[PDB]
Design a protein around this nucleic acid. Structure first.
Lengths: 67, 77, 80, 203, 272
RNA sequence: UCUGAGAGUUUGAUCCUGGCUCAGGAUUAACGCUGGCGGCAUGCCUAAUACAUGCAAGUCGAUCGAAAGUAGUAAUACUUUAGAGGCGAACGGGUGAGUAACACGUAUCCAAUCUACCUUAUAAUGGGGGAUAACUAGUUGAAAGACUAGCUAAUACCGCAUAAGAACUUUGGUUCGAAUCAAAGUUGAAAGGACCUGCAAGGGUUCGUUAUUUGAUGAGGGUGCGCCAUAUCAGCUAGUUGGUGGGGUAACGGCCUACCAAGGCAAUGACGUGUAGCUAUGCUGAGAAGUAGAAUAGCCACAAUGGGACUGAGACACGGCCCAUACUCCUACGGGAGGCAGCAGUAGGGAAUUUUUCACAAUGAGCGAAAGCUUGAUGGAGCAAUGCCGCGUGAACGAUGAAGGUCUUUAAGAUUGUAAAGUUCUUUUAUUUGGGAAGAAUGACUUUAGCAGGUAAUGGCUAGAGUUUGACUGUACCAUUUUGAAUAAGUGACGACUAACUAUGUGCCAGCAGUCGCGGUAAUACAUAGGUCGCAAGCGUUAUCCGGAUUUAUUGGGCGUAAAGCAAGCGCAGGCGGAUUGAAAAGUCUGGUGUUAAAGGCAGCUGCUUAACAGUUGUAUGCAUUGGAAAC
């Protein structure tokens, strides 16, 4: 919504990003690409997460470990 | 909200007119004294301006300044 | 009030009736705790005389307390 | 955890016990190795001073059933007064209600004492006590609220325990009095308290 | 507009929370609002209550739906992977006769009897077809329940990275897939219409115009509840056409019958 | 008693200069998973963007005329306000856009300032006139109202006279730019109300009016020093600078004006530009210091934007007045009404930060003599894991390890694990029944007695008893108060950095990450399973400032080869300097005094079951005067 527009890296197994979707951008850094220092944090207004990852569930937004 | 502000809205206008009248007669006496300097004019100025200085129209500081500046030219004769 | 919710506080403070609470003032006369009232109050008994002698009479809610302490008796000596 | 509900694992991993030794009663193998499954020949991956400092910190903390943030709060209050803070930390920690409750022979474990205290089964200074987070002062007694004196556990364990030398009690009326501060050479301990003092860098 | 869609969603969630008189569906086909209406007036009330209050510009769209796919049984394909990349050798040579079936689901058949390709290299490329069965060679229409039989294959002993296999799997399947000229599979449904048997002429004519099979009536002993086989591609307008033909006296219910073979008049519309 | 933690990384290996990250605390905080409970604290950082509706300061009949009512032929006792008049609306309440400057902070001076209302004493409260609202009448209209004639009253207004003291000018006493004290000329005061004693008589009593005299209060005014960056901002400035005369301000002054005259400030950074509420302080650091200036408190700033002015002691006024501008609302289109950066609340933005709440019980304010009235200040409630803190999901017996998972992958056995199965005890919390306080002995009212200048009395002050005020709360707390462990666990990591390892799937692919980097057929580094550890009703994730970091080095670094000694020289100003003596003491050293608010840092104490907290007892740099010391 502000002036600058930038790149980001999509984490997690698979993805739910095709095109034209609103999402949440968070600070960070990835050491594989030039200038990509942003993270699209999953579990946001539109993108769903890696439904399974119970070891890491604060990131890669997922529910509680299966009952 | 407010219920009696219009009271002061209409109250001051007539009082302001009265104060304008007092100020105008004060200025008339001052001009009369300025036309020619003599004791009777200064006495009339005193008798008609001390009452104004009594009430809250012109503070006594300005009245004292005015009479000092008048008695200066009175004593310049 | 000042201090703590459900545990009020009001310092007996010398001030003139011009401004709000907890602001500019002149002297700190003392304090009273209404949370435990057993006829006791922090009063200097000397500076309050100077405060009373320069106008600015204290808050109306302390007159009975000062009469209990014994300040009115020595203050009304001026009008005697 | 304030109420772990499992202490034998900690005892086996640490080789220590809150009591003298009662956490090995031959219910199967009596093994002093680490619990779980990590190999009986492995010990650890990092064994620096940090590791042993942390190990002693956990030992001391879990010997009392206290949380870490409250431990830091206690250390902060300890920094107020000065002296030999190494033994002063032990002295202040033992001043907690349940510690002296065990030192009174009232109940074998601090967890049992906490369960007794919280449910309203203890009286002190004519006020009901529901927490053991009370800084005990020299010259204070503790009643038992005689309505709840009918607890079988305390009645049975009053005589079958050991009374610390810095506390007294008229166990016939089941009321005890704090005599003086605890000492290092009178209580069973071998903890390197200097490691505890040095480890916490929050202050 | 995308932001228009966002604020429309924000407004319609509240509208559904306040006035329950319609539903809202979002399908993963392309992203479309399937709304429940009562004639055009319902959607006019929708757009009015949206634009006069929320200050939204919006234009309604046409019903967009997909179709399943099934192509002719080919004979051979020539999948080649030639490139010097990856810091090593990249290679792959795949020949598959691709056989769609309507009896069971997907199953993989290994016709590499001599073992010219390793077993450990089969399972990924299998999944590649299973990851390529979602997108066809024309537009991505769903390939459902299709069998794959690896007739022949070859690789490089110290080269031919594994991914290239599945990378080649989509390549050749496209080429012959273009040649195969696939036929569509349309979702055929059943329409139950209760009619007082006094306006059935218009309804029956509209159903006939909508590519259906009608040669009579079947009545519930006092009122006729006719069942008609319908294609989904044109029923949306047919809703209001039937509504106006019967003066709104006759309603219906939609149920999922099955997927049926398509004529050429449907497949000639597969691409522009 | 008090004051300083390291580790990783460039090379075959090593040293060195230098950079980055991790190991620390924290908030005006958010995101994902969750999820007992109390207290305290906190809750638009962005759009000073608009704002629906109601509420946000009124009061005085013991001030006045007019108008209704209760009962009473009349007089009347009381409740009311449409209006006049009096006081107060200039407080309190918020918001940080402009302002980089005597605005703020600090010590000060007003031989330049007013100060109603409160404190002190005093000359006193004399006498008349004309007034106009409401009301009555006539037009207009839907109301809205306004317009036009008539009558009224005062503490409203304007005159008549008396003055201690004041003001003004001459004469004489008199001062470290001016002031004291005498005689004289001149000149100006108002208004009554309530009550008592009296037949009337007058007098007294209470409020209050006017001229004073006192302090205090509050505000204003100029200066010392301190107080952001930028030289890719070299000259800025014309009421600007100064004399004279007048005007004017509350006073002093180009503050304004008429004439005359031409400097002021600057390289020690004007001026221009960018940014910004300042201060006590929050946080970090041992400190010198760095960072932000949320609550809270003081100051100024503005009140849709910009100009003005009246009112009053106090304004150029958050919700007074006029105009212009932009915006917005209503209208029977004649004309009107309006400003939530007051309280909640709505729109929009943003990732995002509360309910369109109960009462003046406590405090304050305004009026009133009081019963009292207004109080969106305030006291509360409620939402909000937003933070801090206590607090629970029980406790004690109970196998050669129940079943089973997992592992041993090869079973024999280990492990999950006294956890469980089972036994006993118990109810914080939960559910039910009862009692149920403090916060308020504050203010008045009425009966008693006393005090005082005083009287015939009535009124003001103190001592005594009774009337009561509680929104919160069925709160807290407890009670043979019923039942029963019952109603209550998560989240990150497990190669090393820094704590804890194994199996299966995955074959430079899917995928990881703050750092080193793992994965090309055995991944302890991916996915997952078991187990383990680090915190905890929270846990982790990104952003901010600090520590680490002597990584802007006064504390506490360098310039030969790594960045860095100008190409060299002459030198303005500045900075720094041979020895002896004297004088004062410009700083310094060292006393006293006054000033550095409150709250807050730190130490002790006290009541909150207890810590969290709050209160109290002290402490805290700096400034100016004053006396010593004269080594520098």
């Amino acid at each position: 919504t502000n002036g600058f527009e930038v790149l980001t890296y999509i984490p997690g197994e698979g993805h739910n990003l095709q095109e034209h979707s609103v999402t949440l951008l968070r600070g960070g850094r990835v050491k594989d690409l030039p200038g990509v220092r942003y993270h699209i944090v999953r579990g946001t207004l539109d993108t769903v997460g890696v439904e399974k990852r119970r070891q890491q569930r604060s990131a890669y937004g997922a529910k509680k470990p299966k009952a | 909200n407010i219920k009696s502000n219009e009271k002061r809205l209409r109250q001051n206008i007539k009082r302001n007119l009265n104060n304008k009248g007092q100020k105008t007669k004060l200025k008339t006496n001052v001009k009369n004294f300025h036309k020619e300097i003599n004791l009777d004019n200064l006495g009339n100025v005193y008798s008609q301006a001390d009452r104004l200085a009594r009430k809250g129209i012109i503070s006594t500081n300005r009245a004292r300044r005015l009479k000092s500046r008048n008695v200066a030219v009175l004593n310049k004769t | 009030r000042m201090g703590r919710v459900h545990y009020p506080t009001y310092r007996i403070v010398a001030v003139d009736s011009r401004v709000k609470r907890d602001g500019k003032y002149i002297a700190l006369i003392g304090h009273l705790n209404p949370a435990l009232k057993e006829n006791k109050c922090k009063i200097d008994e000397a500076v309050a005389l100077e405060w009373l002698n320069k106008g600015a009479k204290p808050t109306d809610t302390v007159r009975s307390l000062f009469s209990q302490t014994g300040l009115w008796k020595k203050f009304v000596e001026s009008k005697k | 955890m304030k109420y772990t509900g499992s202490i034998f694992k900690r005892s086996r991993r640490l080789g220590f016990s809150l009591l003298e030794n009662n956490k090995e009663f031959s219910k199967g193998k009596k093994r002093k190795t680490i619990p779980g499954q990590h190999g009986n020949r492995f010990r650890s991956s990092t064994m620096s001073g940090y590791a042993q400092q942390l190990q002693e910190k956990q030992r001391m903390q879990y010997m009392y059933g206290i949380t870490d943030k409250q431990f830091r709060r206690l250390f902060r209050l300890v920094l107020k007064q000065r002296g030999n803070l190494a033994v002063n930390l032990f002295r202040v920690l033992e001043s907690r209600l349940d510690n002296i409750v065990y030192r009174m022979g009232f109940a074998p474990t601090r967890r049992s004492a906490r369960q007794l205290v919280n449910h309203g089964h203890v009286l002190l200074n004519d006020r009901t006590v529901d927490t053991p987070s009370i800084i005990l002062n020299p010259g204070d007694k503790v009643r038992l609220k005689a309505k709840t004196i009918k607890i079988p556990i305390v009645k049975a364990a009053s005589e079958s325990g050991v009374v610390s030398p810095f506390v007294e009690t008229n166990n016939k009326t089941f009321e005890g009095t704090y005599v003086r501060f605890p000492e290092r050479s009178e209580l069973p301990a071998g903890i390197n308290e200097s490691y505890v003092v040095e480890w916490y860098k929050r202050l | 507009t995308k932001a228009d869609q966002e604020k429309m969603s924000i407004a319609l969630s509240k509208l559904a929370e306040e006035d329950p008189t319609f539903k809202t569906f979002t399908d993963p086909e392309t992203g479309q609002t399937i709304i429940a209406g009562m004639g055009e007036l319902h959607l006019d009330i929708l757009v009015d209550r949206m634009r006069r209050e929320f200050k939204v510009e919006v234009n309604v769209g046409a019903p967009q739906v997909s179709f399943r796919e099934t192509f002719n049984k080919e004979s051979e394909v020539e999948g080649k992977y030639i490139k010097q990349s990856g810091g090593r050798g990249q290679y792959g040579h795949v020949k598959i006769r691709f056989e769609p079936n309507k009896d069971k689901g997907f199953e993989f058949v290994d016709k590499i009897v001599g073992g010219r390709i390793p077993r450990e290299y089969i399972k990924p490329v299998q999944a590649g077809l299973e990851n390529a069965m979602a997108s066809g060679p024309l537009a991505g229409y769903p390939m459902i329940d299709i069998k794959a039989t690896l007739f022949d294959g070859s690789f490089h002993e110290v080269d031919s990275s594994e991914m290239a296999f599945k990378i080649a799997a989509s390549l050749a399947l496209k080429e012959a897939g273009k040649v195969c000229s696939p036929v569509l599979l349309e979702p055929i449904m059943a329409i139950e219409v209760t009619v007082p048997e006094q306006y059935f002429g218009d309804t029956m004519g509209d159903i006939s115009s909508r590519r259906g099979l009608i040669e009579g009536t079947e009545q519930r002993d006092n009122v006729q509840v006719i069942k008609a086989k319908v294609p989904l591609k044109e029923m949306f307008g047919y809703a209001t056409d039937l509504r106006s033909f019967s003066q709104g006296r006759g309603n219906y219910v939609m149920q999922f019958s099955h997927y049926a073979e398509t004529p050429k008049s449907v497949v000639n519309e597969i691409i522009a």
